[PDB]
Amino acid sequence: GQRAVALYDFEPENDNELRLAEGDIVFISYKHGQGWLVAENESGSKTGLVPEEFVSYIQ
16 A cells, blocks of 8 residues: 555544554555545554544655
């Protein structure tokens, strides 16, 4: 997936959503819909939905 980093902490509230902490290394697999990306964690051991505005792509 495409290299990115988490901008803010993200508290899920749902089993479909992936918890983030500010500064986490992640990889974006695809866009699920308006406002939602499917992401994997640094090692690829976990995957889930995160807000589109809570990540930035690594240049």
